[PDB]
Design a binder for this molecule. Structure first.
Ligand SMILES: [Zn+2]
Ligand SMILES: [Zn+2]
Lengths: 222, 276
């Protein structure tokens, strides 16, 4: 009776242009050859620039069926997009194969739910990275009846509204260590000598992308 | 506007009490220095927390984080319109639903909502308080509650101060009219904050934000004596105490909107990408 989780960012289309023939025209095909959009326009780049024409974004979605805290605090799926319990399965299996063409820019898409991220990362590496960033987000938000939040709220209630606004930032340095911790971890995964860096994939802080999806800016697949 | 009304109602009883009364309570025995000090302290708390609630960040989410396609002037595909139902943990027996706000173009997290006035999607939306002039979200709910509590306490302390003053003056009420004015004003501004605080306690006693309550009111239009309890609360915790503790004392969390460099640094989160 339980509804199965699936990558709910992907949408499909039937009017597209197959690959292999330069004279492909938009026609209707069988569902088994239905187009599935997997990589999206790069929101993290200014229009008309170079990286906007060189890169596409791949989103690791938000999940809810993993931990008791997945409703209050964000937690992201630890699986490669294409292996979800309710994802479309093709004949190539778990790799990404170009099948057809779609929207402006003549971007290539495969007729399954697999993602071009599969060309760079593996299941174990993605699981490790996502698990670390999950833990960082959880310990950053913290627990309700924990001393961080309760002390903050108590002194806030005492001084009206001022300790979190003006008076607090002047006095204490090292209470902001988790934000910079997550920033350092992501910047190190991104920096030269890192897993994501070597392979050609860049990650973005969940603080920038509203913490409502874990984005990987990858080269625009061909 | 309407916030200036409340700001005048907050700064007026200070002046009327510091021009006329806060000299015959220091060294007259018509009152207590402890009471004068407490009144001024609670009034400073109320004013500072009202300014804070009126100029704080309700927890707005960035825009256009989930774009789909650059075709047909950024047209939204079909599969994005209908609802999406996703499973929760093995414990919670109810699935959850998720929707795609077509204005900000993000997949709304659970319990977020859209404000038709400010035109942003707040994180845990309660309501758009007109007086404070802000959406009461997740990152300033504690400040809103501190404001209501400070208002109640300041009104009660001013009330008891003016009462002990009027009760101990020998010349009769014909020589202190300002004390009676302050008494009436305190007795009048003690009600509505108390009513709002009790309404919010009863709401947060069943893990219900005001938006959720007025939504679940259904076809019955009685906003007072509706059964505040429901049986399908995914976000239930077990008891009135824990529900209050998890709704009012919620952690603020990081702030998602900041560092505006409009000179083409961090774009697509400010461009008006509406269909027109
Ligand atoms: Zn919106
Ligand atoms: Zn609003």
């Amino acid at each position: 009776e339980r509804a199965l989780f699936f990558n709910y960012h992907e949408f499909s289309y039937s009017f597209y242009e197959d690959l292999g023939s330069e004279d492909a025209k938009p026609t209707e095909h069988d569902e088994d050859h239905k187009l599935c959009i997997t990589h999206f326009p790069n929101v993290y780049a200014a229009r008309g620039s170079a990286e906007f024409q060189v890169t596409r974004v791949v989103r690791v979605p938000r999940r809810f069926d993993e931990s008791r805290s997945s409703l209050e605090t964000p937690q992201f799926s630890t699986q490669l997009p294409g292996s979800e319990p309710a994802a479309i399965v093709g004949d190539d299996g778990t790799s990404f194969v170009r099948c057809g063409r779609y929207d402006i820019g003549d971007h290539v898409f495969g007729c399954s739910s697999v993602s071009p991220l599969s060309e760079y990362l593996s299941a174990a590496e993605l699981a490790e990275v996502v698990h670390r960033v999950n833990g960082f987000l959880l310990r950053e938000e913290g627990e309700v009846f924990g001393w961080r939040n309760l002390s903050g709220l108590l002194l806030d209630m005492l001084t009206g509204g001022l300790w979190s606004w003006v008076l607090g930032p002047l006095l204490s340095r090292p209470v902001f260590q988790e934000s910079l911790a997550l920033e350092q971890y992501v910047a190190q995964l991104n920096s030269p000598g890192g897993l994501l860096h070597e392979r050609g994939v860049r990650l973005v802080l969940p603080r920038r992308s509203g913490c409502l999806s874990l984005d990987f800016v990858v080269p625009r697949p061909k | 506007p309407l916030w200036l009304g409340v700001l005048l109602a907050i700064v007026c009883p200070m002046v009327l009490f510091s021009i006329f009364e806060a000299h015959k309570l220091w060294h007259t025995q018509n009152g207590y220095k402890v009471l004068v000090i407490f009144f001024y302290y609670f009034w400073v708390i109320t004013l500072a927390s009202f300014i804070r609630t009126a100029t704080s960040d309700p927890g707005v989410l960035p825009r256009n984080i989930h774009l789909s396609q650059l075709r047909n002037n950024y047209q939204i595909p079909q599969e994005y319109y209908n609802l999406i139902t996703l499973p929760t943990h093995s414990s919670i027996s109810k699935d959850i639903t998720i929707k795609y706000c077509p204005s900000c173009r993000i997949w709304r997290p659970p319990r977020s909502s859209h404000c038709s006035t400010c035109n942003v999607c707040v994180m845990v939306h309660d309501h758009h308080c007109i007086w404070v002039n802000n959406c009461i979200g997740k990152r300033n709910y504690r400040f809103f509650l501190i404001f209501l509590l400070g208002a109640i306490l300041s009104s009660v302390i001013l009330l008891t101060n003016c009462a002990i003053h009027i009760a101990r003056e020998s010349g009769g009420p014909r020589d202190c009219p300002v004390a009676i004015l302050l008494l009436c004003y305190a007795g009048l501004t003690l009600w509505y904050p108390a009513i709002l605080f009790t309404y919010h306690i009863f709401m947060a006693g069943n893990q219900q934000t005001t938006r959720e309550f007025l939504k679940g009111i259904g076809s019955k239009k009685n906003p007072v004596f509706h059964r505040v309890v429901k049986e399908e609360n995914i976000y239930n915790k077990g008891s009135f105490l824990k529900n209050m503790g998890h709704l009012m004392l919620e952690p603020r969390g990081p702030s998602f909107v900041s560092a505006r460099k409009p000179h083409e640094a961090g774009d697509w989160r400010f461009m008006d990408l509406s269909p027109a």
